[PDB]
Write a protein that binds this ligand. Structure first.
Ligand SMILES: Cc1ccc(C(=O)O)cc1
Ligand SMILES: Cc1ccccc1C(=O)O
Length: 516
């Protein structure tokens, strides 16, 4: 793969790539479609609109939007202008967004109508610098000063050329959270999505022009950003977007060609979603679908899920691991070589190392901490020098994972080096869940660990010590948390206990809880 030139604007790159196919559909969702020509026009008018309201090169804007055709216009338009979109999870709290507003110093916000109420609460509570709120598909009357996304785009002439950025200049941020503390601003460059798109999208997956891509993973996830934006635009594939929460029925409706007159040929999703589909009574038959490739990431794929998918559809599920910091997948199975129970082999372009307790080598078959050296690494966590030093260790990026290397050069997952869980393919801190449980007046103490369900997928399990003089029932605890956590964070079970195992200093021995 040829490096990108030093003067490189990643949006311009994707637009230039598709000037050969102006009339092919770039993106389609339940209510709208953009051809590559229409996407280019609107991308460039958005870029003009953000500049017209005073947002300067290198400043940030918050992009808080459901998956839909306005999403890539917002993302690429900011980048075309040399403005830095900060693309975020749509299922966070007002408090989380308030922090992101302040931390990013965002100058504008591009927000879906459905997300406007959470955003409003964030704006009201924070010391933010937001000059304009631009609302895609408003679901309530616009407040004074706010503007509808379609009017904002349509009122500006397209910018005539892109910001003259360099390849290593910041292009966008994603946020990632660790087991405690605030979300970290992961800073990516213009070059980074070129590398992932070339090395993984093109060279590992062999995506091509006549593909139809559909990612259950939303665009704000590193995984989905590649799967449903940077990958397909690099090869001129058409992309299906869906605003709603992925469920088996929503995914199947799309697989069968229920939206936009297109049937997906490439699907991406978490192992949990694949398990859920295979358990669904109305799982489609092979002859009803056009799938040729199935990708998974977010948590390790249990072999049985992969094998049952293969038996039903005649397609393997290609499990790979990436990270927000590496932007996309660096260790993967291949479409024509899958080894279930492993995450496959290093992606060409990426070097992997397993390090032991002192940074030393590990013999094959022994677990080590996983480090990556490759060209799509983020440069830092914005404003966090200490976290940046721990993760970005001189040309090596630490992942948080442990792996074993096998005799065939494949790698098998061996757990995390922190206390994070991956649940339904999404990070969740057990300490967050603990912090929510102990605010219930009937709870004295709580400890949360990951446990494998019947499919071998990790879910939270909570051990709870009731407060002696209070009432507390499992169904009241369920109702308490329904209210306060995202559904993927729900403990799969809660066990009421009289005490927890502890060190003589009061530290909970979580390892004993995992050992039964
Ligand atoms: C049915 C289904 C498929 C995939 C996902 C996911 O979160 O990726 C969730 C649900
Ligand atoms: C977290 C992540 C980001 C990009 C690509 C894949 C993954 C993964 O979850 O393994």
């Amino acid at each position: 793969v040829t490096p990108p030139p030093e003067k490189f604007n990643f949006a311009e790159h994707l637009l230039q790539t598709n000037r050969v196919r102006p009339d092919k559909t770039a993106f389609v969702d339940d209510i709208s479609s953009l051809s590559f020509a229409q996407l280019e026009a609107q991308t460039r008018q958005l870029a003009a609109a953000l500049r017209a309201i005073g947002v300067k090169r290198e400043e940030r804007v918050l992009l808080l939007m459901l998956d839909g055709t306005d999403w890539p216009v917002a993302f690429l338009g900011a980048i075309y202008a040399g403005i830095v979109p900060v693309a975020v999870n749509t299922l966070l709290t007002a408090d989380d967004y308030a922090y992101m507003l302040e931390h990013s110093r965002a100058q504008a916000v591009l927000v879906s109508g459905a997300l406007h109420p959470v955003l409003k609460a964030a704006l009201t509570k924070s010391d933010h610098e937001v000059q304009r709120v631009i609302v895609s598909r408003p679901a309530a009357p616009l407040e004074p000063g706010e503007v509808d996304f379609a009017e904002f785009v349509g009122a500006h002439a397209p910018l005539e050329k892109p910001a003259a950025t360099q390849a290593d200049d910041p292009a966008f941020w994603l946020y990632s959270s660790g087991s405690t503390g605030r979300p970290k601003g992961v800073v990516h460059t213009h070059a980074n999505p070129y590398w992932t798109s070339e090395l993984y999208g093109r060279n590992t997956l062999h995506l091509r022009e006549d593909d139809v891509c559909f990612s259950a993973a939303k665009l704000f996830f590193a995984y989905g950003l590649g799967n449903a934006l940077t990958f397909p635009m690099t090869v001129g594939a058409t992309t299906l977007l869906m605003g709603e929460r992925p469920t088996p029925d929503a995914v199947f409706k799309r697989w069968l060609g229920g939206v936009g007159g297109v049937k997906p040929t490439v699907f991406y999703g978490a192992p949990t979603g694949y398990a859920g589909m295979l358990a669904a009574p109305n799982l489609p038959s092979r002859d009803q679908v056009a799938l040729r490739l199935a990708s998974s990431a977010g948590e390790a794929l249990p072999a049985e899920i992969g094998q049952r998918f293969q038996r039903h559809f005649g397609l393997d599920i290609v499990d790979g691991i990436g990270s927000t910091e590496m932007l996309h997948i660096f260790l993967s199975n291949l479409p024509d070589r899958v080894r279930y129970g492993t995450t496959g082999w290093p992606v060409p372009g990426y070097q992997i190392e397993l390090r032991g307790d002192g940074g030393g080598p590990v013999a094959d078959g022994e677990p080590g901490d996983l480090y990556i050296h490759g060209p799509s690494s983020a440069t830092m966590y914005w404003g966090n020098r200490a976290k940046s030093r721990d993760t970005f260790q001189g040309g090596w990026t630490k992942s948080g994972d442990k792996y074993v290397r096998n005799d065939d050069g494949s790698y098998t997952y061996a757990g995390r080096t922190d206390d994070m869980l991956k649940v339904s393919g999404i990070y969740v801190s057990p300490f967050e869940i603990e912090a929510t449980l102990v605010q219930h007046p009937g709870v004295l103490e709580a400890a949360v660990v990951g446990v494998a369900d019947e499919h071998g997928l990790t879910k939270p399990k909570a051990y709870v010590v009731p407060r002696p003089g209070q009432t507390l029932s499992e169904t009241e605890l369920k109702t308490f948390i329904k209210d306060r956590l995202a559904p993927y964070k729900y403990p799969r079970s809660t066990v009421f206990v009289a005490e927890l195992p502890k060190t003589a200093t009061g530290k909970i021995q979580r390892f004993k809880l995992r050992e039964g």
